[PDB]
Design a protein around this ligand. Structure first.
Ligand SMILES: [Ca+2]
Ligand SMILES: [Ca+2]
Length: 275
């Protein structure tokens, strides 16, 4: 069967200090939704729990023409392994390895984390991260979309397609009070521009490679930029249709409520054939 519930044991080290978390979750494989609760087993996390997002279950992802390969591998039970490498702008690195076992519609996920080279005065060690937000290149494609006439500004009538007290919102947003929304006024005004895009490719019938560039927002209102490369290793060859319709794009949005000990997480996922 398709998944309905899941658990995660995520553990390892950030800057050589050990952490460990466990918890239960559920999700809806028809629409890509997941939710997860996690609790630390080794006291306070000494680093931003945001560093563990996006890392904290693609078995819940549907494709437009059926199951995703991740879903397919769970339904037949063969499964897959995941290796992810992450590079941050300040030279820090984080890796994650995943393994899964299945019991009907229940997923047991094990995620092993190694993070190094985070400056002690940087936004990870300082608990300064507040959200996961798309890359500036991605937020730009979003801007240029609403900018229907190609002038490089969002005007009052083109600000319609956003909303879809509207005269006030547009008023507030236009900081430089020059009668229209520029890209920086946009980049400040950020609701539903939070969809980070992954690009997916299949080098062979047993491998899928996913690439993602994004940014955390900090407490000082600055951007912490990161890039990721994720390698999916399938136990049995993927069905032919997956190899033919490559590349694939997956838009994802995430939500985290956290203390220093507990994480409550949500994720939404939408696959497309175009970018
Ligand atoms: Ca325009
Ligand atoms: Ca303006």
């Amino acid at each position: 069967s398709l998944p309905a519930t899941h658990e995660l044991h995520i553990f390892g080290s950030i800057n050589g200090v050990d952490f460990d978390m466990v918890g239960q979750g559920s999700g809806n494989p028809n629409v890509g939704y997941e939710e997860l609760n996690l609790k630390s087993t080794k006291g306070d996390l000494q680093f931003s729990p945001w560093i563990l997002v996006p890392h904290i279950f693609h078995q819940y992802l549907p494709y437009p023409d059926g199951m995703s390969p991740f879903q397919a591998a769970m339904v037949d039970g063969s499964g897959y392994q995941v290796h992810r490498t992450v590079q941050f702008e300040d030279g820090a690195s984080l890796t994650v390895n995943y393994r899964y076992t299945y019991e009907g519609s229940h997923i047991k996920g094990e995620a092993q984390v190694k993070g190094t080279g985070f400056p002690a005065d940087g936004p990870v060690m300082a608990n300064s991260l507040t959200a996961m937000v798309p890359s500036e290149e991605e937020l730009s494609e979003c801007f240029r979309t609403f900018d229907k006439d190609g002038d490089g500004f969002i005007d009052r009538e083109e600000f319609g397609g956003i909303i879809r007290d509207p005269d006030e919102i547009f008023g507030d947003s236009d900081t430089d009070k020059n009668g229209r929304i520029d890209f920086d006024e946009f980049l400040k005004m950020v609701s539903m521009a939070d969809w980070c895009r992954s690009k997916m490719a299949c080098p062979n019938d047993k491998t899928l490679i996913s690439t993602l560039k994004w940014s955390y927002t900090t407490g000082n209102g600055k951007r912490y930029r990161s890039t990721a490369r994720t390698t999916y290793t399938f136990a049995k060859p993927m069905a032919a249709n997956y190899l033919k319709n490559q590349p694939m794009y997956v838009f994802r949005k995430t939500e985290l409520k956290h203390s220093k000990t507990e994480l409550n997480f949500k994720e939404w996922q939408k696959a497309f054939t175009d970018v």
